[PDB]
Structure formats: structure tokens, C-alpha cells
């Protein structure tokens, strides 16, 4: 539930930023942390930490 | 026919997911990071529960 | 040593699954924007709203054209409007014309 | 995080006069695109050269806003660094600080004569604290009970 | 999900199945899927083919204007250097300090022409890479990618990330690569055949 909640938060924040209209540094950093969250959900501990 | 799960198996085949198959499986779209209410202990709306 | 108890938040009944004398059912049909029917079995004694949430992702409307009301939707906080709440028309137009004159003298020479 | 530090290493820093000038360019570009839409729908005749140079005004204001946010990104990182170990990791605080930067740069006036970071610090801290309240726990708790829990 | 995201099993578990399918290094796929390097999706060939001639004429004209700026800067610095010569030689004193301003002017002319050569190399590099434009090409230095956007941003399509991988796989017919791999393993030998 913690991992699912984390992915929900990142996805909602990215949807809010993409309807808002933001610079690419913010948007792509949000995309990167979303991708890392999905990887941490599917197999926690494979890549990175 | 893995819908009503009859008691007559022949083969078990694993494949690969598609987005259309996933949204055909699902019974909604979770969009809030909420689980229970802190006081009434009842599940929330459009959350994980 | 450590033996606990506990239960999920919910109670369990014990009935018989008869399949004949059910409540009378009306079947309602909704539709999303992208042509997606979602058949909704209501009661026969049931009001049918014009809109209903579906698994498709959005609130799919009725398949009827009886209730087509699109009215109450607007963005309440636009940057232009909250600019207007703090800045006046003549001041903003003066700034606009000053920057237009600057860019005319820059691009033109 | 290290990649984000290298990404925010590219940016520069400005002063209050340049912030006022950037806000003037932003509001001029916003008036330019409002007039562009205004003459787009039910307009009579959009001038070609005036439409081109006010399109360049609008693009200049947008890029000015982008570089303003890029300049304040390091400031919002240094502001957000004092919230480690409270529920979330650093990245959520960083992005909430970006949201607070967007809200403050909407809600800022160029005739204040105020420093932009000193203006925006309340907004950033407010956004970070309210998001910490929202995403603190597994079960959401209302903010007033959060306040009395803090007390 | 608002934006696509790839699986973790098809990227990280060695051997990287996606990397084997699209013929990339796995560490060089990591930069794509973790948003640290730009990758070109597709690039036109006929429009790029006629714009080779037309934009090489444009490129030569731009380089000529650049060289005009370079020789103008070199001539202005040389005139300041001759002014240093005239305003050191006119007073009869120890010429060691009087040679210092001359050496500073020479060093200034050197850095002017060196910086001009560097931006000329930048022009040569952007045209050379535009001539070298192929799909599945990593582009590091997104500032240089922005240079590619502002000058030669047409005639190709690029993206960055999981949706770029999605675009790549969508525009990827496997049958031609299957026949090519069949021909390689039938005819050749060695490390390339093993791969």
C-alpha cells in the first residue's frame, strides 16, 4: 500500500504539472522519479537502492 | 476460459500483457491515495480500498 | 508466546444463493466519449442519472440525447484573470506597448 | 539527486531589478497572447508584422519565465533541504517546492520592489507543509487534528 | 498513467531483452530510459537529401559571415595592438614593460581567433552530425541538441525516454532484421555471428 500510494502521488503530480504547463527540467525530473517508483514497485532492490 | 474457472484443465499458458487486456481486466481506475477514514474506520472513495 | 486475534473491517452473513426471485432489474446503458458502452443493471424501481462513472476512465454519459447539459464547467483561476485582479488595463497595455516598441527597435534596428 | 544537482548547476542567479524586468516581460507576453486570441476568434484583421513581433514578445516572456524558474530552482532546493526525515524523501519536497514556485510566480507583482526569494519562501514552506500533512501517513488525517497532534 | 513507463524485467535483468532486440548497449539504454541522453527516433532522407545541397550552401554562407566577423575582430584587435606599439614606442624607457602590452594584445588576438575557430568547429560539428543523422543515435549534450533544433530541427524526429522507446518499437518491423540476422549467421562467422 505504501508503494501503490507513492506511485499514485507521483502520477497525480505529473498529471497536474502537464495540465499546468511547466519547464522540461521539472517535467522530466517528475517522469524520472515516476519511472523509478514503478521499478521499485515491481522489483524493489534490483537497480540503485 | 479463465473467467468462471471450470474444473477441467488442459494447459496453462503464460503470455505477455497489453494495456487493452489490463483495462479489460480492471473494474475501475484508482486515483486517490486514501485507504480508510481515521475515525469511522470505513473505506474511502476512489482509493486503494 | 505470541498468539493474537483480529478481523478485517466487515461482517459475514450466511444466506442461500437462490437465483429466481430476485429484485426486478432495469438495465441501463451509458456511453463514454470514445464510444464505450457500459451496461448498468439497476433496479426496475430506480432513477437513472444522465451520467455515470465507468471503468473507461471518465464519467460516461447516457446513451440518450435527453440530458445533454454541458453547462457548469469553467477554469476559475487563469493567470490572465489573476493578472487582471492586480494589474490595470492601461498599465498592462503601456507595458505591452513599451515591450513592442523595444522589440521593434531591436528587430528592425 | 546528483543528476538533478548537475542539472541545476547550469542555471544562473539574478537580482530584484532583473526580476521586475522579467515580470514586465511576462505580463507583456501574457497581454500579447491574450490580444492574439482576442483577434483570433471573431477578430477583424490581425496585422502580420505586429502579430509576428508580439509572437516574439510572447515567446520572450515565456523563456524569461522559464529562466526565472531555473534561477529559483537552486533557491527552492536550499529552502526544501530543511525537511528531511519527515515522512517523504527529498524529491517530493523538491517537486512541491516547484509547485509553490509556480503559484508564487503567478501571485507576484513587479511594483512591490521586493526580493523574489524572500517573497516566495512563505509559499514554498506552506506548500511543503500542507503536502506533508496530506501525505504524512497511511491513513489521511485532517489538518486541524494534525495541528493538535503537533501541539 | 499520464506518461508511459517501461518494465523493469525487460531492461535490467542481464541479458537486457530490450537491448538485445533493439541492438543497444544496456548502459547506453539506461541513459534513455532514465532521462539523461537524447535519442533520435527517425530522420527523413529525400528532404534531407535536397537540403544537403541547399543547407550546405546556407552553411557555407553562414560560415563566411562568421569568418567576416572573425577577421573584423582580428583587425580591431590588431589595430589596438598597433596602438599599443605606437603608445609604447613613443616614450623612450625600459621596453620590457612596453613589450608586455604588445604580448597582451597578441594573446588577445590569439584567443579571439581561437574562440572563432572553436565556434567554427561547432558549425562543422552540427553539419557533420546532421549529415550523419540515423535512427538509434544517442545525442548527449542537450544544449547541442537544442542547437540541432534551432538550426536543423526539421527533417528528423527525436524524442527522449520511455515514450521514445515506445515510438522506436512502434516504428520497428522485425522481419527485415530477422532476415538480416539469418543472412549473417548463415554467411559470416565470429563475434558478430555469435551476437
Swiss-Prot record, chain C:
GO terms for molecular function: bacterial-type RNA polymerase core enzyme binding. The keyword Transcription regulation applies. One of its GO terms (biological process) is positive regulation of DNA-templated transcription. The keyword Transcription regulation applies. Keywords: Transcription, Transcription regulation. InterPro entries: RbpA_sf (IPR038638), RNApol-bd_RbpA (IPR025182). Binds to RNA polymerase (RNAP), stimulating transcription from principal, but not alternative sigma factor promoters. Belongs to the RNA polymerase-binding protein RbpA family. Forms a complex with the RNAP catalytic core and with free principal sigma factors. This is RNA polymerase-binding protein RbpA. It comes from Mycobacterium tuberculosis (strain CDC 1551 / Oshkosh).
Amino acid at each position: 500500500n505504501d508503494l501503490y500510494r507513492r506511485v499514485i502521488n507521483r502520477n497525480n503530480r505529473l498529471k497536474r504539472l502537464i495540465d499546468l504547463g511547466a519547464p522540461e527540467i521539472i517535467v522530466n525530473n517528475e517522469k524520472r522519479m515516476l519511472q523509478e517508483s514503478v521499478d521499485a514497485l515491481f522489483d524493489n532492490g534490483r537497480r540503485g537502492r | 476460459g479463465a473467467m468462471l474457472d471450470v474444473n477441467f484443465f488442459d494447459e496453462l499458458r503464460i503470455g505477455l500483457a497489453t494495456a487493452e487486456d489490463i483495462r479489460q481486466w480492471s473494474y475501475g481506475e484508482v486515483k486517490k491515495p486514501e485507504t480508510i477514514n481515521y475515525r469511522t474506520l470505513k473505506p474511502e472513495k476512489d482509493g486503494l480500498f | 508466546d505470541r498468539v493474537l486475534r483480529g478481523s478485517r473491517l466487515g461482517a459475514v452473513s450466511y444466506e442461500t444463493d437462490r437465483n429466481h426471485d430476485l429484485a426486478p432489474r432495469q438495465i441501463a446503458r451509458y456511453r463514454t466519449d470514445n464510444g464505450e458502452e457500459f451496461e448498468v443493471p439497476f433496479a426496475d424501481d430506480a432513477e437513472i442519472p444522465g451520467t455515470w462513472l465507468c471503468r473507461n476512465g471518465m464519467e460516461g454519459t447516457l446513451i440518450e440525447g435527453d440530458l445533454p447539459e454541458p453547462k457548469k464547467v469553467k477554469p476559475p483561476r487563469t493567470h490572465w484573470d489573476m493578472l487582471l485582479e492586480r494589474r490595470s488595463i492601461e498599465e498592462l497595455e503601456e507595458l505591452l506597448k513599451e515591450r513592442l516598441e523595444l522589440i521593434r527597435s531591436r528587430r528592425r534596428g | 539527486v546528483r543528476a538533478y544537482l548537475k542539472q541545476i548547476g547550469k542555471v544562473a542567479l539574478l537580482n530584484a531589478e532583473e526580476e521586475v524586468e522579467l515580470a514586465k516581460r511576462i505580463e507583456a507576453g501574457l497581454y500579447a497572447t491574450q490580444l492574439m486570441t482576442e483577434l483570433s476568434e471573431r477578430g477583424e484583421k490581425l496585422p502580420a508584422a505586429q502579430r509576428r513581433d508580439m509572437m516574439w514578445i510572447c515567446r520572450d516572456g515565456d523563456r524569461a519565465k522559464n529562466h526565472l524558474l531555473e534561477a529559483n530552482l537552486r533557491l527552492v532546493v536550499s529552502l526544501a533541504k530543511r525537511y528531511t526525515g519527515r515522512g517523504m524523501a527529498f524529491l517530493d519536497l523538491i517537486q512541491e517546492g516547484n509547485l509553490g514556485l509556480i503559484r508564487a510566480v503567478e501571485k507576484f507583482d513587479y511594483t512591490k520592489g521586493y526580493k523574489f526569494s524572500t517573497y516566495a519562501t512563505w509559499w514554498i514552506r506552506q506548500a511543503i507543509t500542507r503536502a506533508m500533512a496530506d501525505q504524512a501517513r497511511t491513513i489521511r488525517i485532517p489538518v486541524h487534528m494534525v495541528e493538535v497532534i503537533n501541539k | 498513467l499520464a506518461a508511459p513507463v517501461t518494465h523493469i524485467w525487460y531492461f535490467k535483468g542481464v541479458p537486457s531483452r530490450l537491448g538485445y532486440l533493439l541492438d543497444l548497449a544496456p548502459k547506453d539504454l539506461e541513459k534513455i530510459i532514465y532521462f539523461a541522453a537524447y535519442v533520435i527516433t527517425s530522420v527523413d532522407e529525400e528532404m534531407r537529401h535536397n537540403e544537403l545541397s541547399t543547407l550546405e550552401a546556407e552553411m557555407a554562407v553562414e560560415r563566411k559571415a562568421v569568418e567576416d566577423q572573425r577577421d573584423g575582430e582580428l583587425e580591431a584587435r590588431a589595430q589596438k595592438l598597433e596602438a599599443d606599439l605606437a603608445e609604447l614606442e613613443a616614450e623612450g624607457a625600459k621596453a620590457d614593460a612596453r613589450r608586455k602590452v604588445r604580448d597582451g594584445g597578441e594573446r588577445e588576438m590569439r584567443q579571439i581567433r581561437d574562440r572563432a575557430q572553436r565556434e567554427l568547429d561547432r558549425l562543422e560539428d552540427i553539419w557533420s552530425t546532421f549529415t550523419k543523422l540515423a535512427p538509434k543515435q544517442l545525442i548527449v549534450d542537450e544544449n547541442l541538441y537544442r542547437e540541432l533544433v534551432d538550426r536543423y530541427g526539421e527533417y528528423f524526429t527525436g524524442a527522449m525516454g520511455a515514450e521514445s522507446i515506445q515510438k522506436l518499437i512502434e516504428n520497428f518491423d522485425i522481419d527485415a532484421e530477422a532476415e538480416s540476422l539469418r543472412d549473417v549467421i548463415r554467411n559470416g562467422k565470429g563475434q558478430k555471428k555469435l551476437r
